[PDB]
Amino acid sequence: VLSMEDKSNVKAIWGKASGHLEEYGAEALERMFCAYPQTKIYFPHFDMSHNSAQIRAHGKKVFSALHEAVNHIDDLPGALCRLSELHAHSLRVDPVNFKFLAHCVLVVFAIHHPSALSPEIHASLDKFLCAVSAVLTSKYR
């Protein structure tokens, strides 16, 4: 469960990605594809070049959803409900891959905002990404 302190920590680090949703979402994606190459089996129709239009457009969508989640961090299940359905019934991605992405998101914040991503804030952001992965996986069976 996310505490009041966790929630303020996450809102503070996340306000630094403001204005950079496409830039940071595309990097997290490129990092996931390169460090965990098994995750490419879910994107066979994508051009995997650096900075490809597809990887940019999807990176933006993913980060935009995370932004909505931060703004509604009291009710994650109601905020991620449509996405939860989409992943369970159509895309059907194995739950283990949500940890790979979450890790790559931490890496991108560590590169762009190293001093902001302190040990206490890293712990809050790690919890938040688990809570988001858990909602995205909640309708699978």
Binding site: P37, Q38, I41, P44, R92, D94, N97, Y140, R141
Partner: protein
């Protein structure tokens, strides 16, 4: 890690009693019922909306047999499991696009099917030998992903 002589004799002796067609059909059917989202890979086989469909789907039953017959060839290549599965590993990645986490999930289900069909042979130590086998088959099949 190699298989010691004891581990090898557990694996070789039990495998010779296994009905591979029956067990293979059971393992794949259980995987699709216990983890329903894995049906994404087999929607070309026809009706799979529920468990009754899966168990009556003849193409699923056949695929489970050929999957377990292929896994069983590990038992005659116990020294060279990575090398024996390397082409099959590249097909999973390049042609079928199968997430490699599935190899460890099916391995765990195969252990439950072996336990139910051979309760008297599937001792604690027999089980530990198979759990190692299933681990190494999963890693060989995940190896050539890129």
């Amino acid at each position: 890690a190699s298989f010691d002589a004891h581990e090898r004799k557990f694996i070789v002796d039990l495998w010779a009693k296994v009905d591979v067609a029956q067990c293979g059909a059971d393992a794949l059917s259980r995987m699709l019922i216990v983890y329903p989202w894995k049906r994404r890979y087999f929607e070309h086989f026809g009706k799979m909306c529920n468990a009754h469909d899966i168990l009556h789907n003849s193409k699923v039953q056949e695929h489970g047999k050929k999957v377990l017959a292929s896994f069983g060839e590990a038992v005659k290549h116990l020294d060279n499991i990575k090398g024996h599965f390397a082409n099959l590993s590249k097909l999973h990645c390049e042609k079928f696009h199968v997430d490699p986490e599935n190899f460890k999930l099916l391995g765990d289900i195969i252990i439950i099917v072996l336990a139910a069909h051979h309760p008297e042979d599937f001792s604690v130590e027999c089980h530990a030998a198979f759990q190692k086998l299933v681990r190494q088959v999963a890693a060989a099949l995940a190896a050539e992903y890129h």
